[PDB]
Design a protein around this ligand. Structure first.
Ligand SMILES: CN1CCN(NC(=O)CN2C(=O)/C(=C/c3c(Cl)ccc(Cl)c3Cl)SC2=S)CC1
Ligand SMILES: O=C(O)/C(S)=C/c1c(Cl)ccc(Cl)c1Cl
Ligand SMILES: [Zn+2]
Ligand SMILES: [Zn+2]
Length: 231
């Protein structure tokens, strides 16, 4: 019932309603001859929408905006990218051209620039130290510390008890560490524990790639990271 790769062709995007006024968006990308799924979030804020992450590329992100317009019919006025990789910021120029205000932490903006990736316009203050949280419209943004990346943010929707872990949290079917080129393996379990401490009441946990679940995804990710550490 949650959409998988086989159900989403290259260039298409699906929306999945998680709770009232909260959806994930699901897209796919092909690389190195394999196909990968990717998630972001959409949160209603009155008569407008907040977008969390792009749909991994310009073409997908254009399709995302068109699917939002068709299915939901409310304007995306702001978008937050939760770290600097292309699955999170690829498509920011499309958002910007469409009149969406784009945001990321100054840490993410800096790393995107170094990588040659698209750079969200606005800088989110107040997220520089592990454990920091700020409200942004209908969500809380939380910097748990370095994990999948040094800049990774998580997002919580308090009205719906939805925690969007982004790429710091792995789906259950993922048993090996992916590409950890930019990760802080040493800190990742501690950063996960900060998420658990701050959001123990979360009822839905959305990873950056793959199937949602509950808070078990946190300990799952810790297990995978620690096994990789000991490789
Ligand atoms: C570059 N590039 C990576 O590092 C990917 C990581 C990944 C892996 Cl290894 C396995 C599964 C998933 Cl879902 C992902 Cl996201 S996909 C991709 S393109
Ligand atoms: O495992 C993940 O969640 C991500 S974002 C992997 C990745 C990395 Cl490490 C660099 C670059 C790109 Cl494009 C991707 Cl997809
Ligand atoms: Zn990443
Ligand atoms: Zn990712």
């Amino acid at each position: 019932e949650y959409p998988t790769v086989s159900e989403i062709p290259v260039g298409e995007v699906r929306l999945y309603q998680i709770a009232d006024g909260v959806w994930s968006h699901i897209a796919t990308q092909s690389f190195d001859g394999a196909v990968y799924p990717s998630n972001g979030l959409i949160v209603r804020d009155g008569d407008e929408l907040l977008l969390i992450d792009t749909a991994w590329g310009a073409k997908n992100t254009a399709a995302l905006l068109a699917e939002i317009e068709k299915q939901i019919g409310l304007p995306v006025t702001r978008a937050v990218s939760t770290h600097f990789h292309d699955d999170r910021v690829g498509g920011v120029d499309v958002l910007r051209a469409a009149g969406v205000a784009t945001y990321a932490s100054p840490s993410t903006r800096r790393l995107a620039e170094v990588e040659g990736n698209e750079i969200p316009t606005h800088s989110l203050e107040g997220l520089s130290s592990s454990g920091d949280a700020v409200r942004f419209g209908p969500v809380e943004l939380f910097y748990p510390g370095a994990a999948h990346s040094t800049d990774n943010l998580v997002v919580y929707v308090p009205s719906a008890s939805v925690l969007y872990g982004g790429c710091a949290i792995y789906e259950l079917s993922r048993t090996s560490a992916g590409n950890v080129a930019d990760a802080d393996l040493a800190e990742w379990p501690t950063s996960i524990e900060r998420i658990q401490q701050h959001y123990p009441e979360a009822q839905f946990v959305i990873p950056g790639h793959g199937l949602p679940g509950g808070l078990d995804l946190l300990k799952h990710t810790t297990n995978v990271v620690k096994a990789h550490t000991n490789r």
